Design a binder for this molecule. Structure first.
Ligand SMILES: NS(=O)(=O)c1cc([C@@]2(O)NC(=O)c3ccccc32)ccc1Cl
Ligand SMILES: [Hg+2]
Ligand SMILES: [Zn+2]
Length: 256
């Protein structure tokens, strides 16, 4: 099935998922000089105080930190969004080297990694129904650079040992996603898609301008994870990013 290797990677995906060459695919390059400040954007509201994490899962592509979404507890609203979007999970994309790893790029600059916090529109009852809608999802994207350690990431880093291979999960309750955010919520926004198959075009993207910094040894442990399942030959989980896709005269708006 789909992956990131030579034979199952990003430009193989279109065969099972034709929407890969669609009109609103993600990620994209953010050309800072082409992005326009948008006055009609309301303030962005990230409310993660009541967030209820449950478990961490190696799903063979990345690792997901999953949340209880059966009540309004961790919600994104405002900015380009209408209504309320509930946090369901977060995950990262990263590289084999510090000079690559992010999915979005800024004036063609690649960051060492990218975090995705995934939320679904409550008017649709659940995630499965929301991903059938043009405004079903909202993803908050955050860039990672190598420098100083990110304290609020270490609990994730420390548990990666327990989920080294595909299908492994561990209890991961009481994780606070607020410790992953940069200071500024200045962002770019554009309509787009999931960046993994089925690549559904249901996402309002909100990509923060300010990167978070993580330590060399934090990213190194991401790179010790496995794409393979237990008892299989070791395939290091690295370079699990899709490259930038055609903008196709969508407009990228700046909040700033
Ligand atoms: N990379 S991503 O943030 O666009 C994203 C990835 C996923 C996914 O790769 N992570 C999953 O666990 C999953 C399950 C079914 C389909 C797709 C996925 C889900 C939603 C989103 Cl918004
Ligand atoms: Hg959709
Ligand atoms: Zn993602």
């Amino acid at each position: 099935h789909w992956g990131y290797g030579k034979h199952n990677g990003p430009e193989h995906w279109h065969k099972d998922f034709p929407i890969a060459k669609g009109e609103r695919q993600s990620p994209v390059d953010i050309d800072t000089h082409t992005a326009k400040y948008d006055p009609s954007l309301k303030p962005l509201s990230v409310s993660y105080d009541q967030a209820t994490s449950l478990r961490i899962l190696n799903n063979g592509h990345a690792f997901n930190v999953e949340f209880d979404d059966s009540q309004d507890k961790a919600v994104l609203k405002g900015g380009p969004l209408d209504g309320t979007y509930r946090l369901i999970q977060f995950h990262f994309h990263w590289g084999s080297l510090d000079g690559q790893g992010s999915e979005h790029t800024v004036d063609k600059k690649k960051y060492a990694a990218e975090l995705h916090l995934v939320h679904w529109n409550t008017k649709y009852g659940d995630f499965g129904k929301a991903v059938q809608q043009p405004d079903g999802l909202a993803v908050l994207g955050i860039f990672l650079k190598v420098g100083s350690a990110k304290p609020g990431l270490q609990k994730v880093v420390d548990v990666l040992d327990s989920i080294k291979t595909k299908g492994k999960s561990a209890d991961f309750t009481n994780f606070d996603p607020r410790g992953l955010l940069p200071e500024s919520l200045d962002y770019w926004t554009y309509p787009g898609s999931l960046t993994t198959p089925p690549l559904l075009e249901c996402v309002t993207w909100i990509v923060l301008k300010e990167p978070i910094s993580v330590s060399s040894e934090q990213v190194l442990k991401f790179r010790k994870l496995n794409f393979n399942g237990e008892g299989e030959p070791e395939e290091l989980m690295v370079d699990n990013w899709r490259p930038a896709q055609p903008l196709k005269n969508r407009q990228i708006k700046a909040s700033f």
